[PDB]
Amino acid sequence: GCCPPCARSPNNECSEWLLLWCYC
Numbered sequence: 099g100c101c102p103p104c105a106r107s108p109n110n111e112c113s114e115w116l117l118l119w120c121y122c
Contacts, residue, residue, distance in 0.1 A: 099120070099122070100120045100122045101116055101119035101120030104116050104119070
């Protein structure tokens with residue numbers, strides 16, 4: 099479902115792969 103707030107963390111570039119975890 100909707101990934102935990104990961105992309106809001108500038109230190110955590112997870113936003114790259116996070117798109118597979120969530121898009122909502």
